[PDB]
Amino acid sequence: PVARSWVCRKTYVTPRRPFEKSRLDQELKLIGEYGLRNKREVWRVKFTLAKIRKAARELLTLDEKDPRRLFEGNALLRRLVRIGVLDEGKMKLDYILGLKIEDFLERRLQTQVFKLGLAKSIHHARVLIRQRHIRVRKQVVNIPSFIVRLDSQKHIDFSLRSPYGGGRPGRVKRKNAKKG
Amino acid sequence: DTVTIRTRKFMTNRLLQRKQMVIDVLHPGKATVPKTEIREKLAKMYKTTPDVIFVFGFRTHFGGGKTTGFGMIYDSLDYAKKNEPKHRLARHGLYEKKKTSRKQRKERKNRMKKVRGTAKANVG
Amino acid sequence: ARGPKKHLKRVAAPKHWMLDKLTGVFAPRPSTGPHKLRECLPLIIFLRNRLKYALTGDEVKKICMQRFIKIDGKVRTDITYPAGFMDVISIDKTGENFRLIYDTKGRFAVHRITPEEAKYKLCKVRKIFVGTKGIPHLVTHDARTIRYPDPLIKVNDTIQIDLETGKITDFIKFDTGNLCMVTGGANLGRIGVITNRERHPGSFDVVHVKDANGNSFATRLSNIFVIGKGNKPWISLPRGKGIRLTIAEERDKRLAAKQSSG
Amino acid sequence: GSLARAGKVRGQTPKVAKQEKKKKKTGRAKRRMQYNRRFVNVVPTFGKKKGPNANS
Amino acid sequence: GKCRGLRTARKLRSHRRDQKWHDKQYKKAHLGTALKANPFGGASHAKGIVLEKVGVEAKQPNSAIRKCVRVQLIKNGKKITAFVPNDGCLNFIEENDEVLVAGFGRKGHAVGDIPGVRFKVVKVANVSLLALYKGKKERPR
Amino acid sequence: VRMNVLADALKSINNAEKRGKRQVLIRPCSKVIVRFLTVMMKHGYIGEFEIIDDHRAGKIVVNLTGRLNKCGVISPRFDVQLKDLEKWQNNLLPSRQFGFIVLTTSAGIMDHEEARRKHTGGKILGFFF
RNA sequence: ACGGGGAAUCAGGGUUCGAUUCCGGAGAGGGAGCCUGAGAAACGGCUACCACAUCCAAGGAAGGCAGCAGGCGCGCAAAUUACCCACUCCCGACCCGGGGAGGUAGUGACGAAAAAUAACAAUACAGGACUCUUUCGAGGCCCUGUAAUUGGAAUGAGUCCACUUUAAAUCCUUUAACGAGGAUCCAUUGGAGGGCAAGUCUGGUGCCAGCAGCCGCGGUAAUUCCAGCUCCAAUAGCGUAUAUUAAAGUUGCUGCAGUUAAAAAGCUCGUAGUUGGAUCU
């Protein structure tokens, strides 16, 4: 007997066909467009989208006036419009089925700090986040896969200790200025 | 610049003759603030002497913004020596634990188990 | 296997204690006492997990050995003492009285009561029997043996017990139209008026109870505890008045409260 | 059925030392390079869809 | 045709249970004769001692000498023929040394040209054949 | 021998509709057959029909409008709860936009949609689309 | 074959697993019999026999790790003879003692989560085109790549302080110092005939050596061995063996077949079994 919890789960699904050319090109296009590291991130976002779609289908097979459908569909739509994937005007269960993977990839912190002009490219966005230059509200966020909520979009600043937002020169700048 | 101290969840435990609280330490560009000066800031803030203040469990948040810990402020030093864990008193130099390992004590007990009478004290 | 068990696993503990899963392997095994193992709140859970006067069980022991806690007017130093439905927990040092009462989620709420209402409790009589040269004895849900009860008092009735003397002050009969709470099953913690008791000889009687909001439910007869004569309770009720809300209504109330509070 | 010849071809293969080349990119940069080579420009194509390792 | 009746559950289940025994895979995995005749005894690998080096002639369409070894398993003393996969890898094996042997990939079936050989050598003298093959490791002395 | 007169009736209707005939003779008739045919008619799948009364068991002349793709019986009459109704619909119906599973419930013989409306399960008699 | 909660897989139905931390049972080398006690047929209690085994001065005495570590053995197959009662609880006469329960570290690529191995500018180069004349050309006005081109910026891996952590501690978090241009601080594991993504490029061998799950490749121009180069697949992971699930509508209840591909008994009767016409508001 241990107090430890063994609860864990795999956050992605490996494709059934390993060498489908169309799937390889589509995943590579997603990777290049959003600056992802490997296929596993695409498969991860795919798994989240698939689970959301499965929940939406299961709720849709229910009676419309069934209380569980109302409660859980409302919660799911509220979460989807909370993270910005779903528009507040489109708040029906069958509107969940029309979501893409790019909808979720757009809400990543990497994509957001690229879009908000903080970085020159998406790979610069990744290296900026990984190097602790980006903060969400008051919290220094270090994860590029961090999914930004709508109420958190307006607070993505350049950190108060970063050389780009706080004005303490980095190791390289200080070392170079010493020789000067 | 300076270190800020706030006390989120304050309660007065008259059962244990103390005040217990959660301490938020704001220190944007410093290492985790030492407990010895958190205690003196709490002493100034709550108008008491810093030897009845026991602070523990301080966890700095990712990025270096603030550190969260827990703290007690006892009505008197005697009530502190009564209601405080021995290790936290020892952190203040108010208690010294035994200088023997578990192995030494266990084999001493099992060796004493083999003798009867006053001779038990003759083996150590 | 051989003889009684003395431990209780953390995950095998009653779910209404709201214990964690990572704070140890063991849960406080309640001592033997007036209430059942799964229908009680051990004193350590109340003084540490609910009231938060203690951070560890050692602090609960320190609090209890100063004789600061009284259950039903008697000082208890057992930190695992089983405290259950209708028990009065008095702390004179901090000057507060609580009554162990059920919430609509089936959990012992932290219900503060006045010093005047801490002088008594309500007990459901579990049996009545004539014994020992003709004296009628009455046994209650808290195993309190009272001799010479009123001859009108029967099983499933409720009696108001003065905690100082342990004697019956008044009683409420089990009847349709009387306020009651549910002490077991799915409807645990709900408060309503009894509407119909349908008898099953040789089996469990089923009692139907209507909420103060119009909602109706059913329980087994053993799970009913008469609370008041008519619809007025003889004791104070929690923040919720025994009216269980649906998840949609509870969500709407929570959202509105957060909108109007902060 | 003689086992005398066991490392014949590998033993008699003229040993060639691998060249020295700059390290390949790893992780996200390698995927970025692949995406650039395959989707950004149509310079390496002919309208015939030739292969990445075409030696012709 | 099949019985379609509300009270035919017993007959349908019994028929399915009897007819499952006519499936080769089910009968193989549920009789015990295959498990008792398996040299590995149901294991995935087995350690054995090389008794000699043999050259098995490839099947008729092909022409080659596949280098294998006769190994006697430590677990049960059973003698099997294990293929030594790569080239020059039979040179890494010496007589009366310990080899770890796995299956050939077809679950008790012969693989390719090699007739009657269902095992392959994975380790020799507690060093993998692949590490010796690429020069990563050398034979213990 | 002959069992499940509803099966024979539905087979006759199906075979006549495949042949393009405007009418089909069903014999023998039954209460279940008439109720199934009425459920079929209210949805416009077969149109009017006439019960010929011979003094042993009825016959039915069903006018056929060529709107019927398949009418089938489900033998045995499996008892269906409201939960399993969706699985039965997925198995037997060509689409969620049309097609009806007929059940006998304590409220009568009706399609699956009316069974959901009345909140009742029953025993599946057949389907039509 | 300990049972169940449950796990893997799964369109629907199902198939397989469940020694394993929770509940219930059983046992303490195998049997058996008991004492004590509220509770044991208890084994970190006793009494025998059976097996094995320890000390002996040979008269006797003493055993039970399927507790925690650690050995041996077995095997394809599994970690420290570590620290602590600080947590969780338990026991006691007990606020105070004790607990290899339990907690904490060690070993750990069982698995699961996050996640580096570069980013950005100028320089020209293979460079394009809704930039323009008139296809011819100017190509800092809209982006890739030669890079042993240049340039500064950024940062953590690492080393090392001080806190913080915690029962001493470690780790994470925090702070400072040093820490990046082959940023040599150098990513691998399998493949490149088809299935199945990626070379009929070069050298070697010549039905040999070998490759190859399958089909097949190899007998002097090998897209398949052995190599070099290049290329693609996943990526801090990837290959292999075995078992198993889906694929398998190749176990078919959903939902298979039975003239000739495997298959209706030679033929009837017949009990159980299965199935059974209309009809009652």
Which residues in chain C are classed under CATH 2.40.50.740?
A: 121-171
- Shortest CA distance to F59 belongs to which of F101, F12, F103? F12
* Residue A166, Ramachandran bin (φ over 0: left; ψ between -120 and 50: alpha; else beta): alpha
Determine the Cα–Cα distance for residues F54 and B74; give it in Å rounded to an integer. Answer: 103
Interchain pair B62, A138: CB under 8 A: no
Dmax (CA) of chain C:
67
Determine the Cα–Cα distance for residues C235 and C102; give it in Å rounded to an integer. Answer: 13
Query: Residue with structure tokens 């008044």?
Result: C170
Breaks (C–N over 2.5 Å) after residues, chain D: none
Using the CA of F87, which nucleotide's C1' is the nearest one? G12
Determine the Cα–Cα distance for residues C158 and C101; give it in Å rounded to an integer. Answer: 15
* CB contact at 8 A, F52 and F59: yes
Using the CA of E100, which nucleotide's C1' is the nearest one? G76
* Chain D residues touching residue E89 (CB < 8 angstroms): 6
Q: What are phi and psi of E69, to 5 degrees?
A: -135, 140
Determine the Cα–Cα distance for residues F128 and C247; give it in Å rounded to an integer. Answer: 40
- Shortest CA distance to B22 belongs to which of B73, B94, B88? B73
Which residues in chain C are classed under CATH 2.30.30.30?
A: 174-244
Q: Quick count: other Cβ atoms within 10 Å of Cβ B38?
A: 23
Which tokens belong to F80? 């269906």
Helix or strand run (H / E) with residue B19: strand B18-26
Cβ-based burial of C217 (10 A; exposed 0-12, middle 13-18, buried ≥19): middle
Which tokens belong to C31? 């001592």
The reply to whether B93 Cβ lies less than 7 angstroms from strand G is: no
The reply to whether D52 Cβ lies less than 7 angstroms from strand G is: yes
Determine the Cα–Cα distance for residues F13 and B73; give it in Å rounded to an integer. Answer: 91
Determine the Cα–Cα distance for residues E8 and F46; give it in Å rounded to an integer. Answer: 35
* CB contact at 8 A, B48 and B73: yes
Give exposure, C111-136, as e/b (b: 16+ Cβ within 10 Å): bebeeeebbbbbbbbeebeeeeeeeb
Determine the Cα–Cα distance for residues E140 and E128; give it in Å rounded to an integer. Answer: 12
Which tokens belong to B61? 């948040």
Neighbours of chain B (3+ CB pairs under 8 A): A, C
**DSSP string of C104-172, one letter each residue:** TTSSEE--EE-TTGGGEEEEEEEEEEEETTTEEEEEETT--EEES--TT--TT-EEEEETTTTEEEEEE
CA nearest to F79 within chain E: E6
Cβ-based burial of F94 (10 A; exposed 0-12, middle 13-18, buried ≥19): exposed
Determine the Cα–Cα distance for residues F21 and F65; give it in Å rounded to an integer. Answer: 9
Identify residue F10 by its one-letter amino acid code.
Answer: L
- Shortest CA distance to B19 belongs to which of B83, B67, B89, B66? B83
Q: Quick count: other Cβ atoms within 10 Å of Cβ A166?
A: 14
Query: Residue with structure tokens 């030897």?
Result: B51
> Cis omega before residue F76 (within 30°)?
yes
Q: Where are any strands of DSSP class E within chain C?
A: 40-42, 70-71, 74-75, 82-84, 88-91, 96-99, 101-102, 108-109, 112-113, 120-131, 135-140, 145-147, 158-162, 167-172, 179-182, 191-198, 206-211, 216-220, 224-228
The reply to whether C12 Cβ lies less than 7 angstroms from strand G is: yes
Cβ-based burial of C93 (10 A; exposed 0-12, middle 13-18, buried ≥19): middle
Q: Report angle CA F26, F27, F28 to the nearest 5 degrees.
A: 135
* Chain D residues touching residue E129 (CB < 8 angstroms): none
Domain ranges of chain F: 1-68, 69-129
The number of domains in chain B is: 1
Identify residue C82 by its one-letter amino acid code.
Answer: P
The superfamily in CATH containing domain C121-171 is Ribosomal protein S4, central domain (2.40.50.740)
Contacts of F111 (CB under 8 A, 6+ apart): F39, F43, F100, F101, F102, F103
**DSSP string of F68-125, one letter each residue:** -S-EEE-SS--EE-TTTHHHHHHHH-S-SSS-EEEEEETTEEEEHHHHHHHT--EEEE
Q: A118 CA, G130 C1': separation in Å? A: 29
The reply to whether F88 Cβ lies less than 7 angstroms from strand G is: no
- Shortest CA distance to A33 belongs to which of A95, A87, A110? A110
* Chain C residues touching residue A3 (CB < 8 angstroms): 10, 21-25
Tell me the Cα Rg of chain E: 21
Using the CA of D3, which nucleotide's C1' is the nearest one? G209
F69-129 topology per CATH:
Dna Ligase; domain 1 (3.30.1490)
* Chain C residues touching residue A70 (CB < 8 angstroms): 248
CA nearest to D7 within chain E: E88
The reply to whether F8 Cβ lies less than 7 angstroms from strand G is: no
Task: Please give the residue range of the domain that contains residue B56.
Answer: 1-124
- Residue with CA nearest G143 C1'? D40
SS3 of B15, please?
coil
Dmax (CA) of chain E:
74
* CB contact at 8 A, C189 and C244: yes
Determine the Cα–Cα distance for residues F71 and F82; give it in Å rounded to an integer. Answer: 22
Q: Taken in order A140, A146, A152, A156, is the CA torsion positive or negative?
A: positive
- Between chain A and chain D, the number of residue pairs with CB atoms below 8 A apart is 31
Determine the Cα–Cα distance for residues F50 and F24; give it in Å rounded to an integer. Answer: 11
Which tokens belong to C109? 């709420």
Q: E6 CA, G276 C1': separation in Å? A: 13
Q: B2 CA, G153 C1': separation in Å? A: 31
Determine the Cα–Cα distance for residues B57 and B55; give it in Å rounded to an integer. Answer: 7
Which tokens belong to C71? 């259950």
* CB contact at 8 A, B56 and B28: no
Q: Quick count: other Cβ atoms within 10 Å of Cβ C26?
A: 14
Determine the Cα–Cα distance for residues C158 and C174; give it in Å rounded to an integer. Answer: 7
Cβ-based burial of B3 (10 A; exposed 0-12, middle 13-18, buried ≥19): middle
CATH 2.30.30.30 fits C174-244, yes or no: yes
Determine the Cα–Cα distance for residues C174 and C159; give it in Å rounded to an integer. Answer: 11
Strand bridging mode E119-124 / E79-83: parallel
Contacts of B54 (CB under 8 A, 6+ apart): B71, B72, B74, B80, B84, B88, B91, B92
- Shortest CA distance to F49 belongs to which of F72, F26, F17, F21? F26
Determine the Cα–Cα distance for residues E134 and E12; give it in Å rounded to an integer. Answer: 58
Q: Quick count: other Cβ atoms within 10 Å of Cβ C159?
A: 23
* Chain B residues touching residue A138 (CB < 8 angstroms): 65
CATH number of the domain at F1-68, out of 2.60.120.560, 3.30.1370.30, 1.10.10.10, 3.40.50.720? 3.30.1370.30
**DSSP string of A63-82, one letter each residue:** -TT-HHHHHHHHHHHHHHHH
- Shortest CA distance to E133 belongs to which of B69, B76, D10? D10
Distances (CA, A) of C1 to C4, C5, C6, C61: 8, 8, 11, 30
B62 CB within 8 Å of a chain A CB: yes
Q: Which residues pair with B53 in a beta bridge?
A: B73
Which tokens belong to E91? 């040179």
Determine the Cα–Cα distance for residues A104 and A53; give it in Å rounded to an integer. Answer: 13
Task: Please give the residue range of the domain that contains residue E5.
Answer: 1-141
* Residue C139, Ramachandran bin (φ over 0: left; ψ between -120 and 50: alpha; else beta): beta
The reply to whether B101 Cβ lies less than 7 angstroms from strand G is: yes
Name the residue facing D28 among A28, A33, A123 (closest C-beta): A123
Name the CA dihedral angle for E35, E40, E45, E47, rounded to a multiple of 10 degrees: 160
Name the residue facing A37 among D31, D35, D36 (closest C-beta): D31
* CB contact at 8 A, C185 and C224: no
CATH 3.30.479.30 fits C1-116, yes or no: no
* Chain E residues touching residue D11 (CB < 8 angstroms): 88
Q: Quick count: other Cβ atoms within 10 Å of Cβ A79?
A: 13
- Residue with CA nearest G74 C1'? E75
- Residue with CA nearest G41 C1'? C2
The order of strands in the sheet holding A135-136 is A139-140, A135-136, A156-157
Q: E52 CA, G78 C1': separation in Å? A: 33
* CB contact at 8 A, A75 and A28: no
* Chain C residues touching residue A1 (CB < 8 angstroms): 9, 25
* CB contact at 8 A, E104 and E83: yes
CA atoms within 13 A on the CB side of C37: 14
Q: Quick count: other Cβ atoms within 10 Å of Cβ B122?
A: 9
Q: Which residues pair with B67 in a beta bridge?
A: B25, B60
Enumerate chain D positions whose Cβ falls within 8 A of a Cβ in A: 27-29, 31-32, 34-36, 38-39
The reply to whether B72 Cβ lies less than 7 angstroms from strand G is: no
DSSP annotation of C45 reads I
Q: Taken in order C149, C152, C156, C158, is the CA torsion positive or negative?
A: negative
- Shortest CA distance to F40 belongs to which of F72, F5, F81? F72
> Cis omega before residue F28 (within 30°)?
yes
Which tokens belong to F40? 């079929």
* CB contact at 8 A, B8 and B22: yes
Q: What are phi and psi of C214, to 5 degrees?
A: 95, -15
Q: A6 CA, G86 C1': separation in Å? A: 25
Strand bridging mode B53-60 / E79-83: unpaired
Q: Taken in order F98, F103, F105, F109, is the CA torsion positive or negative?
A: positive
Q: Report angle CA C77, C83, C89 to the nearest 5 degrees.
A: 70
